[PDB]
Nucleic acid binder design. Structure first.
Length: 607
RNA sequence: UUAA
C-alpha cells in the first residue's frame, strides 16, 4: 500500500510494486498516493488491456500530440477515432494529474471494428476477452491505430497530411519473381515491423539495437508461395518519428537482455546507398548528405507478473523549455511516477520485454507541446443544428449570447445500461454504460433564464439491456431512423458542445454533475462547477432532488419519468436559492432544517 | 444515498 511508487527492487527477479496489478477502481477512489506528477494517468476500467499504454506513448510525441489536439479547432465529426483521440489528448493535458478515462475513445474503436488486409479489424475486435494480452497484439494495434489515423487524416477539413509526413516510411517492395524481371510496389507504411528474423548478426559490430532497425529497413528474404519467390524491401525515407513494432522470440528475447545498454538513447544516421544503417553518433558515416539525429521519445514494455499476469507500461521522455533537460516518466495504469534515465532504459529484468519502441527527431522532440486554445476554434454547433433524425420546447442560442468565461447555465444528462457487473473472475468488473440524453438550459439572469438550448438524444446502435426510465427519460426509440419523437444526433457532436463550454469557461450547475461528466467522459475544473449535491451536503446522506424540490420550495418532481429538461431546471433555481440563503447569514440555520425534519420523516414525504 |  504505502510504498507502491517504488520502481526498483534489489533482486533482478522481483517485480517492483509500481509494475503490478493495481486494485480495481470500479466510488471516490483516491488517486493521490498513486500519482504525484502533473501528468494524468488513465482509468483501467476499459475493455482493452493494451490500448491504455499506447495512448500514453503517443500523448508525448510533440508532433503527433500537437496535431491531434490541433484538429479540435475544426468540427471533424466523421473522423471518429482522431477527434475522440483529440478530446482525450486535450483532456489529459489539462487535468494535470487528475484521473482520466479513455471510455469514449474505446467506444469509437469498437464502433469501427464492428463495421466490417481487412483482417486487422477482426483481430483487433478481441475487445471481448483480453492471459490478458497475447503476443504481438500491441504491435498489431500500434499499426492499426496509426493506419486508421492517417486514413482519417485525409478526411479532415482542409485535408492535412501531417501524420504521414512523420510516420511515412516509403517502402520499396521489389519482388524478384523472375531473373532480369522484377515487380516492385511502393507502399507508405506508418510503422516498421521488426518481426520473424533468421540467423542474424547480433554479436559483432556492437550488440546494440541499431542493426535491428537496419535489417528491417534493408532486407530481402527467400520464402514465399510452389515458387519460393524472393522479394526486396528497402526504405528511402528517414521520417520525423519511427514507430518500431518489436516482435521477437523468447529465445532471442533473453539474449538481448544480457547485452548491457542494448537500447540507444540517441542515434544519428542517413542513407548512403539505397540501404540504410545508422551509427551510435559514433561518426561512422562513409559519405554524407542530409543528416538526421534521433533521440528516443518513449516506448511500451510488457510486464510479466510474479504471479504470471501480464500488463503493459509506458516509459516516456519529456523536454523542459526552461532548462535543457530530459525528465523520464513511467505509466502504469493510474500509477505515474518520475524515474531516472538509467532505470528507464535498463533491460536486465527478465519480467520486462519491449513491445513498441518509438524514436523521434531530436530538434522536434525539444519542440514544445501546444494547447488547442493556442488556436481559435469553430464554436458553430453551439448556434447551429446538426440532427441525424427526422424530427422538446427549447430555444437555440444567438450570437449576442456569446458564452464567456463564467456563464452560469445548468446541465443534466441521462444514460442507459448495456452490460452489468460481469464480475467474480478475479473478485472482471462492471464495464459498460452509455449516455442517451443531455440538456443544457440557460441560467444567466435575464429574459432568457431557465430556458433550454440543447436537448439532444444521442445515437446508439449497440445492444441495450436496461432502459429504466423510472430514472432516465429515454423513450425506447433511441435508434437513428425510428426517432422516439426526439432529435437524435451523434455522440461526437454533443460532446463538442459540452467540450466547447468548459473550454471557454462556462459554469455548470446541477445535481451530482461530476457523475454526469464521468459518463459523458469529460473533466471540468473544480472551480467551474456548482454542484447542489455538494452545497446541501451534511457530511454524508446525499439528499434527493425530488425531496428538495418538495422540501425547499413547492414543486413535486417525483414519480414522473425523470425528464432531464426539468431536473436541470430544478437544479438551476436551487443554486439560486442556495445563493439567497448564503448572501443572508442563514446558511446552516436553514441547512439543519430538513435533514433534521427528514430523519423524523424518513427522508421521503408524500408525493 | 445522491446519481442514474
Amino acid at each position: 500500500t504505502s510504498d507502491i511508487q517504488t520502481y526498483t527492487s534489489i533482486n533482478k527477479y522481483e517485480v517492483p510494486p509500481a509494475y503490478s496489478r493495481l486494485p480495481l477502481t470500479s466510488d471516490n477512489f483516491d488517486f493521490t498516493p498513486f500519482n504525484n506528477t502533473e501528468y494524468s494517468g488513465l482509468d483501467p476500467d476499459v475493455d482493452n488491456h493494451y490500448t491504455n499504454a499506447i495512448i500514453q506513448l503517443y500523448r508525448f510525441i510533440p508532433e503527433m500530440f500537437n496535431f491531434v489536439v490541433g484538429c479540435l479547432k475544426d468540427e471533424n465529426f466523421e473522423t471518429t477515432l482522431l477527434t475522440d483521440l483529440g478530446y482525450l489528448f486535450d483532456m489529459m493535458e489539462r487535468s494535470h494529474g487528475k484521473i482520466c478515462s479513455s471510455s469514449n475513445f474505446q467506444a469509437s474503436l469498437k464502433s469501427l471494428t464492428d463495421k466490417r488486409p481487412q483482417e486487422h479489424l477482426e483481430e483487433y475486435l478481441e475487445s471481448l476477452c483480453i492471459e490478458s494480452i497475447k503476443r504481438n497484439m500491441p504491435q498489431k494495434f500500434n499499426r492499426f491505430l496509426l493506419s486508421q489515423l492517417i486514413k482519417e487524416e485525409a478526411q479532415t477539413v482542409n485535408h492535412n497530411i501531417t501524420l504521414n509526413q512523420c510516420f511515412g516510411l516509403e517502402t520499396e517492395i521489389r519482388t524478384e519473381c523472375s531473373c532480369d524481371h522484377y515487380d516492385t510496389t511502393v507502399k507508405l507504411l506508418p510503422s516498421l515491423s521488426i518481426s520473424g528474423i533468421n540467423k542474424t548478426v547480433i554479436k559483432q559490430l556492437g550488440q546494440n539495437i541499431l542493426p535491428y532497425i537496419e535489417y528491417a529497413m534493408k532486407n530481402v528474404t527467400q520464402k514465399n508461395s510452389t515458387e519460393t519467390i524472393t522479394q526486396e524491401c528497402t526504405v528511402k525515407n528517414l521520417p520525423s518519428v519511427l514507430s518500431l513494432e518489436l516482435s521477437l522470440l523468447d529465445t532471442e528475447f533473453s539474449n538481448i537482455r544480457s547485452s548491457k545498454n542494448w537500447l540507444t538513447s540517441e542515434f544519428y544516421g542517413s542513407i548512403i546507398k539505397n540501404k540504410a544503417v545508422l551509427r551510435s553518433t559514433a561518426s561512422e558515416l562513409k559519405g554524407t548528405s542530409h543528416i538526421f539525429k534521433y533521440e528516443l521519445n518513449g516506448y511500451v514494455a510488457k510486464i510479466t507478473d510474479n504471479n504470471n499476469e501480464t500488463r503493459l507500461v509506458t516509459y516516456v521522455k519529456k523536454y523542459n523549455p526552461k532548462e535543457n533537460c530530459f525528465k523520464w516518466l513511467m505509466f502504469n495504469d493510474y500509477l505515474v511516477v518520475e524515474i531516472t534515465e538509467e532505470e528507464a532504459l535498463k533491460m536486465t529484468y527478465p519480467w520486462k520485454t519491449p513491445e513498441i519502441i518509438i524514436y523521434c527527431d531530436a530538434e522536434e522532440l525539444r519542440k514544445p507541446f501546444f494547447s488547442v486554445d493556442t488556436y481559435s476554434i469553430n464554436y458553430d454547433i453551439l448556434f447551429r443544428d446538426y440532427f441525424a433524425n427526422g424530427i422538446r420546447e427549447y430555444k437555440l442560442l444567438t450570437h449576442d449570447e456569446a458564452p464567456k468565461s463564467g456563464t452560469l447555465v445548468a446541465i443534466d444528462a441521462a444514460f442507459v445500461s448495456l452490460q452489468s457487473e460481469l464480475c467474480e473472475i478475479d473478485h472482471i468488473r462492471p464495464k459498460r454504460t452509455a449516455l442517451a440524453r443531455i440538456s443544457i438550459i440557460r441560467g444567466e439572469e435575464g429574459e432568457l433564464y431557465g430556458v433550454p438550448f440543447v436537448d439532444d438524444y444521442v445515437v446508439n446502435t449497440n445492444h441495450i439491456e436496461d432502459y429504466l426510465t423510472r430514472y432516465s427519460g429515454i423513450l425506447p426509440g433511441d435508434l437513428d431512423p425510428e426517432k422516439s419523437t426526439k432529435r437524435l444526433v451523434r455522440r461526437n457532436v454533443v460532446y463538442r458542445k459540452v467540450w466547447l463550454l468548459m473550454q471557454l469557461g462556462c459554469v455548470f450547475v446541477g445535481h451530482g454533475l461530476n457523475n454526469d461528466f464521468k459518463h459523458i467522459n469529460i473533466n471540468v475544473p473544480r472551480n467551474q462547477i456548482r454542484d447542489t449535491a455538494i452545497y446541501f451536503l451534511q457530511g454524508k446522506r446525499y439528499l434527493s432532488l425530488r425531496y428538495l424540490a418538495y422540501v425547499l420550495l413547492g414543486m413535486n418532481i417525483q414519480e414522473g419519468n425523470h425528464d432531464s429538461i426539468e431536473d436541470a431546471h430544478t437544479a438551476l433555481i436551487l443554486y439560486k436559492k442556495y445563493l439567497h440563503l448564503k448572501e443572508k447569514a442563514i446558511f446552516e440555520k436553514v441547512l439543519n432544517s430538513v435533514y433534521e425534519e427528514g430523519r423524523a420523516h424518513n427522508f421521503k414525504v408524500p408525493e
